């Protein structure tokens, strides 16, 4: 029976030291980031409000 | 093309192989 699940292992993500920054895993899939043009417009509108 | 044991030993360290340790950990059970 080939059964295997998501093994997070709790050691790659949360660092062992208390001095290391937490690692940043990254999936660049388009489905995981839904709003592209909508969200970057709000980043653009906040940039114009910040520069004024 | 079968591998040599030297490149087999180098592959086990470089891939994070735990099968060799798990076999070596269940091998002994009251060996004395």
């Amino acid at each position: 029976m080939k059964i295997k699940t998501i093994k997070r292992s709790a050691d790659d993500y949360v660092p062992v030291k208390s001095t290391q920054e937490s690692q940043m895993p990254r999936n660049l899939n388009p489905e995981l980031h839904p709003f592209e043009r909508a969200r970057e417009y709000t980043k653009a509108l906040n940039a114009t409000k910040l520069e004024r | 093309p079968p591998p040599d044991e030297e490149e087999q030993l180098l592959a086990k360290f470089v891939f994070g192989d735990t099968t060799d340790l798990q076999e070596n950990l269940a091998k002994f059970n009251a060996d004395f």
């Binding site: 062992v16 208390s18 | 994070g16 269940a26």
Partner: protein, 431 residues
């Protein structure tokens, strides 16, 4: 039930998996040697650099740790965690840790051992997951500060709840609180499994066996009042003394002799049970230092029990086992000691088996009676068997010499029992 009591069951299950950096901070700060701040700010490899130096020093001391270099202290034993591996291999990881702690329970007064077990604490979470075998291994060092350190790290199981006020305590646990721990009925069975695993792996030493005897004697003494409790306590300390006698070491035999004496003195037993106590002591006794302790134990075990047939004849299996394992000259030189313990019930039970089985050596009882001072009824039972010996044996003159001692002192006793069995004037005709 309610909700929050079920959550603590989940929290006790998942107390080793790190979820946040706060949970990693509160788990990596468990430290045998370093303080809290240094433990939180060090990596797994830096602990392993000192760990490989620690086990190399221990492999110099005893070479049994050379196995653990390649299974528990390999460089491949860094990336793996207990909480990523399934149930079929965490059992193999558990008893491998238990095999290491048993092989390193003796070596604890050395700083190489504390550095070696520090990485086993941090990498394999043994201060939360398997806390019992760690605490049993170091239990004899309770006066030492390394036990006070271990209590400050560990989370206590429900069975060691008597040490719940001694975690993070500036004063060490005392002698009285260790007996209150050992007074628990279930904890004695768990230490039995620890001791049976200790004997089976053949690593039993003086200090943990001195301490185990010092608590087994007290737990009978603290339960000497309740006769029901000592009835409940009989199948533990006798099974321990069965396994301790089965060990071939020079130390477990004397330690089993200490348990068997005080338990029978605080609790008289059935004759067949103490008869089995003879054969288990007499079986594997070959240590020279343990032969003197075994003779005093069989001496004390015979005078514990009281009743009819107390000083009767031993079985021939036990008597020939005692003849091989103890010479008659050896027990005579034991009686030569001016301390002269109370061997009265054993000697009159020994010589009745002498008069029954061998029927040839009666010069020993001539030297036995001159050495020991016997009571009234034991002399009567000796003379009655020697009178029965006078009926059946083809009477040599040394039998007449033996009764010549019997008329030299307390001649009314031999005359009275001769009136009970036969005629007084018929003794000279028959001898």
């Amino acid at each position: 039930s309610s909700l929050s009591d079920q959550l603590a069951q989940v929290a006790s299950n998942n107390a080793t998996v790190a979820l946040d950096r706060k949970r990693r901070q509160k788990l990596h700060s468990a430290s045998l040697i370093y303080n809290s701040k240094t433990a939180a700010t060090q990596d797994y490899d830096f602990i392993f650099e000192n760990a490989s130096k620690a086990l190399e020093e221990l492999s110099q001391i005893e070479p049994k740790f050379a196995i653990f270099s390649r299974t528990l202290f390999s460089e491949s034993s860094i990336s793996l965690d207990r909480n990523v591996q399934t149930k079929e291999e965490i059992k193999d990881l558990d008893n491998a840790i238990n095999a290491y702690l048993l092989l390193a329970s003796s070596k604890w007064y050395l700083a190489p051992t504390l550095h070696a077990t520090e990485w086993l604490v941090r990498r394999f979470q043994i201060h939360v997951k398997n806390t019992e075998m760690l605490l049993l291994s170091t239990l004899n060092y309770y006066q030492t500060p390394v036990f006070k350190r271990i209590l400050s790290i560990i989370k206590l199981p429900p069975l060691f709840n008597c040490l719940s006020n001694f975690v993070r305590s500036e004063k060490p646990p005392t002698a009285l609180t260790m007996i209150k721990l050992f007074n628990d009925m279930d904890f004695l069975k768990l230490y039995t499994s620890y001791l049976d695993q200790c004997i089976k792996h053949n690593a039993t030493y003086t200090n943990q066996l001195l301490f185990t005897t010092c608590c087994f004697i007290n737990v009978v003494a603290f339960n000497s009042n309740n006769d029901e409790k000592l009835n409940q306590l009989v199948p533990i300390l006798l099974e321990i003394s069965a396994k301790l006698l089965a060990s071939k070491s020079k130390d477990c035999q004397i330690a089993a002799h200490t348990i068997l004496v005080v338990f029978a003195t605080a609790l008289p037993l059935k004759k067949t049970i103490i008869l089995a106590a003879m054969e288990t002591i007499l079986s594997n006794l070959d240590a020279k230092e343990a032969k003197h302790s075994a003779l005093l134990t069989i001496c004390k075990l015979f005078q514990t029990l009281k009743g009819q047939g107390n000083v009767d004849q031993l079985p021939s299996k036990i008597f020939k086992l005692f003849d091989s394992k103890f010479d008659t000259v050896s027990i005579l030189t034991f009686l030569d000691k001016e301390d002269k313990p109370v061997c009265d019930k054993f000697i009159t039970s020994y010589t009745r088996s002498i008069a029954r089985y061998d029927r040839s050596k009666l010069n020993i009882i001539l030297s036995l009676l001159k050495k020991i001072r016997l009571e009234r009824y034991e002399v009567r039972l000796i003379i009655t068997d020697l009178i029965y010996l006078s009926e059946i044996l083809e009477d040599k003159s040394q039998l007449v010499e033996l009764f010549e001692y019997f008329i030299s002192i307390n001649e009314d006793l031999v005359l009275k029992c001769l009136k009970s069995l036969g005629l007084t004037g018929x003794x000279x005709x028959x001898x």
